[PDB]
Amino acid sequence: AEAGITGTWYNQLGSTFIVTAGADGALTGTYESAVGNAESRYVLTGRYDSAPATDGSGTALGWTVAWKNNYRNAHSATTWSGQYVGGAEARINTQWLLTSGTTEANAWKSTLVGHDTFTKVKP
C-alpha cells in the first residue's frame, strides 16, 4: 500500500530514508547517509509495484540516490532493490549497487554491492 511505505525509515548503519509512495507507483523523498563522502540530504526517486499481494508476499520496489547535492559531489550513485514487508514491525529488505564514475581502465572496479534492512519509525 503506498501509505505503509510512506514514512521515515533507518537502516543498521544509521542512515535515514524519508519517503512518500504516490498513487501511481512513484517513490520520492530524501536520503541522509551515515557513511561515504556524503553530507546532508540527497534526493531519491524510485518506483514500487502496487501488488494485489494477498499472499503474505512483499511489495517489490527500488530507488536511486545520486550522491550530489549543494554541499558535496561524490560522482557516484546507489540503487536499492528489495521488498517491503508490513505488519507490526514493517521492514524493507534490500540489496544495493553503488557505482562510481571511473576511467575505462578502472571500470572493472566501479561497483560495490551490499545489503541493508530498513526499520520504519514514522509515517
Cβ closest to a copy of itself, residue 7 vs residue 42:
42
Residue 83 φ then ψ, to 5°: -145, 150
Phi, psi of 116 (to 5 degrees): -135, 145
Residue 31 contacts residue 40 (beta carbons within 8 Å): no
Q: Report CA-CA distances (Å) from 66 to 25, 52, 63, 117.
A: 20, 31, 10, 20
For the chain, count helices (H), then strands (E): 1, 8
In the bound state with Cl ion, the residue whose beta carbon lies nearer, of 21 and 31, is 31
Binding partner of 14, given a copy of itself, Cl ion, none, CB within 5-8 angstroms per partner class: none
Contact call for residue 94 and Cl ion (CB under 5 A): no
- Please choose which of Cl ion, a copy of itself, none residue 15 contacts, taking the beta carbon within 5 to 8 angstroms, the exact cut-off set by kind: Cl ion
Which stretches of the chain bind a copy of itself, using CB under 8 A? 13, 24-27, 35, 43-53, 55-68, 73-83, 85, 93-104, 107-115
Which stretches of the chain bind Cl ion, using CB under 5 A? 15, 33, 36
